[PDB]
Design an enzyme around this catalytic site. Structure first.
Site, short mmCIF file in Angstrom:
data_model
loop_
_atom_site.label_atom_id
_atom_site.label_comp_id
_atom_site.label_asym_id
_atom_site.label_seq_id
_atom_site.Cartn_x
_atom_site.Cartn_y
_atom_site.Cartn_z
N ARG A 153 -13.29 -6.06 9.93
CA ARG A 153 -13.61 -4.93 9.07
C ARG A 153 -15.09 -4.83 8.75
O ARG A 153 -15.52 -3.81 8.19
CB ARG A 153 -12.81 -5.02 7.77
CG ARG A 153 -11.31 -5.08 7.96
CD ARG A 153 -10.58 -5.23 6.63
NE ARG A 153 -9.14 -5.34 6.81
CZ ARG A 153 -8.30 -4.32 6.78
NH1 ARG A 153 -8.72 -3.08 6.58
NH2 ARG A 153 -7.00 -4.54 6.96
N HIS A 180 -2.83 -4.90 2.06
CA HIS A 180 -4.08 -4.62 2.81
C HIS A 180 -3.82 -4.40 4.30
O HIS A 180 -4.49 -3.53 4.88
CB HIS A 180 -5.10 -5.75 2.57
CG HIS A 180 -6.51 -5.36 2.83
ND1 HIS A 180 -7.08 -4.24 2.26
CD2 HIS A 180 -7.48 -5.94 3.57
CE1 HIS A 180 -8.34 -4.14 2.65
NE2 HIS A 180 -8.60 -5.17 3.45
N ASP A 198 -4.22 0.15 -3.29
CA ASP A 198 -4.31 1.19 -2.26
C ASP A 198 -3.29 2.30 -2.51
O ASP A 198 -2.37 2.54 -1.72
CB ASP A 198 -4.15 0.59 -0.86
CG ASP A 198 -5.39 -0.14 -0.40
OD1 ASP A 198 -6.36 -0.23 -1.18
OD2 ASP A 198 -5.40 -0.64 0.75
N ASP A 253 0.82 -1.20 0.00
CA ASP A 253 0.00 0.00 0.00
C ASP A 253 0.86 1.26 0.00
O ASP A 253 1.92 1.31 0.63
CB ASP A 253 -0.92 0.01 1.22
CG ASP A 253 -1.85 -1.19 1.26
OD1 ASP A 253 -1.77 -2.03 0.34
OD2 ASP A 253 -2.65 -1.29 2.21
N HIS A 283 -1.09 4.68 -0.30
CA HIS A 283 -2.03 5.59 0.35
C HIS A 283 -1.59 7.05 0.22
O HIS A 283 -1.60 7.82 1.18
CB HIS A 283 -2.23 5.21 1.82
CG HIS A 283 -3.05 3.97 2.01
ND1 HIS A 283 -4.40 3.92 1.71
CD2 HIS A 283 -2.73 2.74 2.47
CE1 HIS A 283 -4.86 2.72 1.97
NE2 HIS A 283 -3.87 1.98 2.44
N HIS A 301 -4.47 -8.19 -3.48
CA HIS A 301 -4.49 -7.18 -2.43
C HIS A 301 -4.95 -7.78 -1.10
O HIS A 301 -4.19 -7.80 -0.12
CB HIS A 301 -5.39 -6.02 -2.83
CG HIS A 301 -5.38 -4.88 -1.85
ND1 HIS A 301 -4.22 -4.22 -1.51
CD2 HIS A 301 -6.37 -4.30 -1.14
CE1 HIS A 301 -4.51 -3.27 -0.63
NE2 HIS A 301 -5.81 -3.30 -0.39
N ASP A 358 -6.18 7.86 -0.98
CA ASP A 358 -6.75 8.02 0.36
C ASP A 358 -5.68 8.00 1.45
O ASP A 358 -4.59 7.46 1.25
CB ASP A 358 -7.79 6.93 0.63
CG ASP A 358 -9.04 7.09 -0.22
OD1 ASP A 358 -9.49 8.24 -0.39
OD2 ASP A 358 -9.56 6.07 -0.71
N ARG A 359 -6.01 8.59 2.60
CA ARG A 359 -5.13 8.60 3.77
C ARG A 359 -3.75 9.16 3.43
O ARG A 359 -2.72 8.68 3.92
CB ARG A 359 -5.03 7.21 4.39
CG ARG A 359 -6.36 6.66 4.88
CD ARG A 359 -6.29 5.17 5.12
NE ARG A 359 -7.54 4.64 5.67
CZ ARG A 359 -7.77 3.36 5.92
NH1 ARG A 359 -6.85 2.43 5.67
NH2 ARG A 359 -8.94 3.00 6.44
N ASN A 382 -8.69 -2.36 -2.34
CA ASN A 382 -10.01 -2.09 -1.78
C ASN A 382 -10.34 -0.60 -1.77
O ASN A 382 -11.52 -0.24 -1.80
CB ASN A 382 -10.12 -2.66 -0.37
CG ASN A 382 -9.31 -1.87 0.64
OD1 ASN A 382 -8.08 -1.92 0.64
ND2 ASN A 382 -9.99 -1.15 1.51
N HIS A 383 -9.33 0.26 -1.80
CA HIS A 383 -9.56 1.73 -1.78
C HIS A 383 -9.80 2.25 -3.19
O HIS A 383 -10.26 3.39 -3.32
CB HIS A 383 -8.40 2.45 -1.08
CG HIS A 383 -8.55 2.52 0.40
ND1 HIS A 383 -8.94 3.68 1.05
CD2 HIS A 383 -8.38 1.59 1.36
CE1 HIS A 383 -9.00 3.46 2.34
NE2 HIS A 383 -8.66 2.19 2.56
CL LIG Z 1 -7.86 -0.15 4.45
MN LIG Z 2 -6.43 -2.12 1.44
MN LIG Z 3 -4.61 0.09 2.77
#
Ligand SMILES: [Cl-]
Ligand SMILES: [Mn+2]
Ligand SMILES: [Mn+2]
Ligand SMILES: Nc1nc2c(ncn2[C@@H]2O[C@H](COP(=O)(O)OP(=O)(O)OP(=O)(O)O)[C@@H](O)[C@H]2O)c(=O)[nH]1
Ligand SMILES: [Mg+2]
Lengths: 293, 174, 505
Positions: A215, A242, A86, A58, A60, A167, A89-90, A118-119
């Site tokens: 989650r 992930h 990923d 990831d 991010h 992922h 985001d973040r 997943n993002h």
């Molecule tokens: Cl996440």
């Molecule tokens: Mn992820």
């Molecule tokens: Mn992530």
């Protein structure tokens, strides 16, 4: 020409203090998204890659760490790269990260590969900041174009028929690779099914077989599930992301599964390191670790 | 949501003319999306762990070829199935007429007087282009003595999961 | 696979049924053998005794390679090997003079086996989802082939001998890396289904018009820059999809000659104007998709003869206005004009009696024209991300309206006639300037979803909102709600509904 100019403008901030943004016009980003979507649809959803290859976890939106990873492993096309998802985001510089990744994918389609995380979903982006950053710096049309580009990303990759890269992880519905091959694109990430488990599942040592995931979506799987999957599909290693890991990598099921995280100092709240796995022709995997600040 | 162990396996086969929407229905059931483009199918198999009537089961849905050019091993794939969905398009009279031929083919390959199957009327959202009425479909179902259901693969889906669940229930009953 | 970690080396340390089935087949003298889905890695050599077999099904297994004993099955007519790990085929298969169908989908073949080129009796060949990178000139031997599918490979060019397969009916070379189509393809006059989608084709040969029996032609997602005029000879085509190409113009007689054309797709192309020609070119198509282009003007009278056209998509174009005959589109059912520079809607829109779905999102509209209520059959109206200031009172006449989207608009108040929309089930009012909701909102019994988030002036909700028994999903995010107790607001939508119901007069 224009692509080289975009890459140069994205890389000119290398070595400077973190936080310096790169100002690219909306038309260039839109063209990058369109061409990347075309290239993604031009390639199979289940990639079959060959060593040598660099595998990263990831990001991010931590662009400066993406640059550190490239410096450690060599900027393309010196070495092949496989990213597990990923990318947004973040992070304060998700746009720069995704633009650089798309530019590298366009310039080197056969040596640069990006898997869907997943993002990389409209619902997740709308909540976790990518939509906010796009609205602040551009219009919502660019965000919709990014969503269209993300909907065509490949899901899983296989390296030398021995390493399975995804992922999230394994799925209870996953019994053959043709099931992954039959996933249609473009598609949004569903709340249940093979794609959702492939993007959201996580291993757990306390689970014998399959169990609920904290989650709130997908399932957790134990070491026995990984061993049975590897035996059935004649694979040797599962490479995943992930999940955040302190050392940047962590083995599971007696080194039969490895989780890779590439962003050090995740979200500014963790002291974890970022690691990248290097695979050679002999499949002798090695990990390069970015020490945290 | 965690499936249990030693789940029974139900092999579901979807049959019908070309372009009636078998692949679209299967993708909506599994991938929960609607594919607007048309691509002829040779053979595709899908697997899912789902719970029906508080009983976990493994559904192995098999998609066959509606076109005669692509229907080379269709009889072999049908021979290995446990349940059948006879799908026709309400906007195509030929697909509705070929329901008799498909039923006869299923009976011949299974070598049985009766077999679990359901008549599916697809594309019911296309009300302006609909040529086969609900009365004709129920009459066809009543003659063959099989359940009748109308489905729409286009978003929002209509009874897409209901058809497969009803087929599984019919398989369980017999 | 091994790991060089901790200054050392670490590693990821972890057929009776087939024999019985073969014996049963031999005892019963069956002409069909089914060993599919049995996790078979090595096929037993005892299968050579089954000389009477005509159909062999070994698909969905783990076979690395077939034994040479398979060549003793001279009577085989069907050989299914899909979904295996085969990398090559034994040369002993030359003895299979009666083999008619060979299935090799989803395998690991790096190239077509040389023995396959010698199986001249084959009529159907499947090679989908392999690693084949080239086709040899020995394909000419397979003159009896009628179905050839080699899609999902890495083939970059096709040999000129492909034109000697005059018996071909369907040719599938999609999802490959082909850049040019040989002119010999026109010699296969019996082809009815030719697939060329998801390739890198730059142009089509002028001999493609010799395929008089062609009915399906896949050209989406390529690099085509023009369409040859010979394609008009293929009058049997039912759909012409040209999505994601570089095509900017079409031959004048192309669409006119396509008498059987039911749908036309020109999305994601370089079109800046409608195709040159009369209205007759659109007389047969049911749907017209021309989104993501750069079209700026719709010609006057273009759809005069388009009696059958019902769906029109003009999303993401350069449209700034509408033709004067916009009200003459009485056959229109679904109209999409999203993401354009439209500033106003002409009053002629009242003539679209058959219209059911209208999308006008991402435009510069400031007010809905009077007469919009004449759309009796209208069902879905999309107006997201516009500059609307107020809604006309004629909206109360949309009895069949079911979904209304007004997100990201400058609306301040809603008309009191909104309560007549008894069929309305979805109402998106987010990111608006709504100070309050009308009391008539409680008469919408069928309303299921209501979105009110990001409204900065929505300080109170009417007590009639609790009358919506079918209201299941509601968004009230970021709303001030200064006229309601903070505890109920923080409780959630259900608490607000309960408070409205309890205090309802
Ligand atoms: Cl996440
Ligand atoms: Mn992820
Ligand atoms: Mn992530
Ligand atoms: N509007 C609408 N179109 C549908 C529906 N179901 C299927 N279609 C369309 O039907 C066409 C064919 O769909 P497929 O799923 O390929 O049909 P099929 O019968 O499985 O096709 P073959 O495998 O070639 O026999 C496509 O254009 C679909 O979008 C539906 O419920 N509504
Ligand atoms: Mg199909």
């Amino acid at each position: 020409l224009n692509l080289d100019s975009i890459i140069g403008r994205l890389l000119e901030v290398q070595g400077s203090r973190p936080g310096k943004n790169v100002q690219l016009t909306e038309n260039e980003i839109r063209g990058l998204c369109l061409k990347s979507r075309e290239i993604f649809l031009s390639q199979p959803i289940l990639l079959e890659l060959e060593a040598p290859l660099k595998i990263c976890g990831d990001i991010h939106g931590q662009y400066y760490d993406l640059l550190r990873l490239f410096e450690y492993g060599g900027f393309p096309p010196e070495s092949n790269y496989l990213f597990l998802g990923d990318y947004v985001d973040r992070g304060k510089q998700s746009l720069e990260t995704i633009c650089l990744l798309l530019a590298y994918k366009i310039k080197y389609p056969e040596n640069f590969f990006l898997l869907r995380g997943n993002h990389e979903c409209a619902s997740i982006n709308r909540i976790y900041g990518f939509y906010d950053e796009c609205k602040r710096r551009y219009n919502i049309k660019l965000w919709k174009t990014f969503t269209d580009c993300f909907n065509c990303l490949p899901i899983a990759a296989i390296v030398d028929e021995k390493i399975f890269c995804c992922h999230g992880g394994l799925s209870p519905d996953l019994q053959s690779m043709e099931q992954i091959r039959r996933i249609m694109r473009p598609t949004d990430v569903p709340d249940q099914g093979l794609l959702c488990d492939l993007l959201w599942s996580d291993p757990d040592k306390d689970v014998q077989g399959w169990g609920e995931n904290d989650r709130g979506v997908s399932f957790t799987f134990g070491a026995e599930v990984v061993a049975k999957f590897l035996h059935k599909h004649d694979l040797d290693l599962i490479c995943r992301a992930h999940q955040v890991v302190e050392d940047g990598y962590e083995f599971f099921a007696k080194r039969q599964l490895v989780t890779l995280f590439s962003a050090p100092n995740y979200c500014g709240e963790f002291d974890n390191a970022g690691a990248m796995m290097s695979v050679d022709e002999t499949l002798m995997c090695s990990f390069q670790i970015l020490k945290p600040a | 949501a965690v499936p249990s162990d030693n789940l029974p396996t139900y092999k579901l086969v979807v049959v019908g003319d070309g372009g009636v929407g078998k692949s679209a229905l299967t993708i909506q059931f599994f991938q929960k999306i609607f594919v607007p483009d048309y691509d002829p199918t040779i053979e595709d198999s899908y697997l899912k762990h789902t719970e029906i009537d508080n009983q976990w089961a493994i559904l192995d849905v098999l998609d066959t070829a509606g076109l005669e050019e692509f229907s080379a091993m269709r009889e072999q794939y049908m021979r290995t199935g446990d349940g059948f969905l006879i799908v026709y398009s309400v906007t195509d009279k030929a697909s509705f007429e070929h329901v008799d031929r498909f039923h006869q083919l299923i009976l011949r390959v299974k070598d049985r007087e009766s077999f679990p199957m359901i008549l599916v009327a697809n594309k019911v959202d296309l009300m302006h282009l609909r040529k086969i009425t609900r009365e004709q479909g129920k009459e066809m179902a009543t003659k063959h003595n099989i359940p009748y259901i109308e489905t729409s693969a286009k978003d929002p889906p209509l009874n897409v999961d209901k058809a497969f669940h009803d087929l599984v229930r019919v398989i369980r009953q017999q | 696979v091994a790991f060089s970690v901790d200054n050392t080396i670490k590693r990821p340390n972890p057929n009776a049924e087939v024999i019985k089935e073969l014996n049963k087949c031999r005892e019963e003298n069956s002409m069909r053998l089914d060993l599919s889905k049995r996790s078979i890695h090595i096929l037993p050599s005892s299968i050579k005794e089954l000389t009477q077999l005509t159909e062999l099904y070994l698909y969905s297994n783990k076979l690395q390679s077939l034994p040479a004993e398979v060549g003793c099955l001279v009577n085989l007519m069907t050989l299914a090997l899909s979904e295996n790990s085969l990398t090559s085929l034994p040369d002993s298969l030359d003895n299979l003079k009666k083999l008619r169908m060979l299935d090799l989908r989803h395998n690991k073949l790096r190239e077509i086996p040389s023995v396959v080129y010698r199986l001249d009796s084959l009529t159907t060949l499947y090679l989908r989802f392999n690693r084949i990178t080239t086709v040899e000139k020995d394909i000419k031997n397979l003159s009896k082939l009628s179905m050839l599918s080699i899609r999902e490979n890495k083939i970059k060019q096709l040999p000129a001998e492909i034109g000697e397969l005059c018996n071909l009916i369907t040719l599938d070379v999609a999802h490959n890396q082909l850049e040019h189509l040989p002119k010999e393809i026109g010699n296969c006059t019996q082809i009815t289904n030719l697939d060329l989608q998801h390739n890198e084709l730059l142009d089509l040969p002028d001999t493609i018009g010799n395929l008089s029996s062609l009915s399906r032609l896949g050209l989406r997602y390529n690099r085509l820059s023009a369409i040859p005029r010979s394609l008009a000879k293929c009058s049997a085509l039912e759909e012409l999809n040209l999505e994601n190409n570089n095509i900017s113009t079409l031959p004048e007689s192309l669409l006119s000659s396509l008498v059987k054309l039911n749908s036309l797709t020109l999305a994601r192309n370089c079109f800046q104007l409608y195709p040159v020609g009369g209205p007759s070119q659109f007389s047969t198509i049911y749907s017209l998709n021309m989104e993501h282009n750069r079209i700026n003007k719709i010609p006057f009278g273009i759809f005069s003869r388009a009696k059958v056209l019902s769906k029109l998509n003009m999303k993401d174009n350069q449209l700034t206005s509408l033709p004067l005959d916009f009200g003459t589109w009485t056959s229109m059912v679904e109209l999409n004009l999203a993401t354009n520079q439209l500033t106003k809607i002409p009053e002629d829109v009242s003539g679209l009696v058959s219209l059911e779905v209208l999308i006008l999102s991402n435009n510069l509209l400031k007010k809905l024209p009077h007469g919009l209520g004449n759309l009796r059959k209208l069902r879905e109206l999309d107006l997201e991300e516009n500059k609307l200031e107020s809604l006309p009172n004629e909206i109360a006449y949309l009895k069949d309206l079911q979904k209304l989207v007004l997100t990201n608009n400058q609306l301040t108040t809603l008309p009191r006639g909104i309560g007549h929309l008894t069929n309305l089930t979805h109402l998106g009012l987010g990111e608006n300037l709504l100070t309050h909701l009308p009391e008539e909102i409680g008469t919408l019994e069928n309303l299921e979803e209501l979105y009110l988030n990001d409204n900065p002036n929505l300080h109170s909700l009417p007590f009639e909102l609790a009358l919506c028994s079918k209201l299941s999903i509601m968004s009230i995010e970021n709303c001030p709600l200064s006229h309601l107790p903070p505890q109920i607001v923080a409780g959630g939508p259900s608490f607000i509904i309960q408070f409205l119901k309890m205090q309802g007069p």
